[PDB]
Amino acid sequence: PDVSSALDKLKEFGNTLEDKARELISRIKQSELSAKMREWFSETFQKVKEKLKIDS
Amino acid sequence: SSALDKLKEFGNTLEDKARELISRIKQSELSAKMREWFSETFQKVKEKLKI
């Protein structure tokens, strides 16, 4: 058996998990930006419609 | 934007569990290396002392 190789494997895993978890956070923030901009485009076009409509 | 802000807490949770895991692996490592070392030392002492 290889107790030393097993532990080193887990440190490797542990260290990657910690770095990828940080990267997950950034992908969430990207979709957040996406979702918020979709909300903003719709809202603002809604306003445009209304403003023209109440002016023919 | 609910699914996002609490998914962020998810990232933070994974990050903390990662660190914790590493801390624990290192402690296991120290423990095993001390166990091997003590055992080897005792063994050599035994041999030099003819039981």
Author numbering:
A (entry chain B): 2 to 57
B (entry chain A): 5 to 55
What does the literature reporting this entry say, word for word?
Apolipoprotein C-1 (APOC1) is a 57 amino acid polypeptide of Mr = 6.6 kDa that is synthesized predominantly in the liver of mammals. This small protein is remarkable for being the most positively charged protein in the human body, with a lysine content of 17%. The protein has a high affinity for lipid surfaces, particularly chylomicrons, and both HDL and VLDL particles. It was then discovered that APOC1 is a potent inhibitor of cholesteryl ester transferase protein (CETP), which is the crucial enzyme in the transfer of cholesterol between lipid surfaces (tissues) and lipid particles.
The dimer from crystal Monocl-1, once known, was simply placed in the unit cell of Monocl-2 with the same coordinates; the two helices in the dimer were rigid body-refined and then subjected to restrained refinement. Although the movement of the two monomers within the dimer toward one another is slight, it significantly increases the interactions between them. The buried surface area is enlarged an additional 7% to 4,050 Å2 and becomes 22% of the entire surface area (19,021 Å2) of the entire dimer. As in Monocl-1, the hydrophobic stack interaction at one end of the dimer is fully maintained, but the opposite end of the dimer shows the two monomers pressed more closely together. In Monocl-2, the hydrophilic interactions appear a bit more certain and involve Arg39A-Ser27B, Ser43A/Glu47A-Arg 23B, and Lys 50-Glu19B/Asn16B/Asp20B. Although the band seen in Monocl-2 likely represents the compression limit (the monomers can get no closer to one another), it is not certain that the bands found in Monocl-3 are necessarily the limit of maximum expansion.
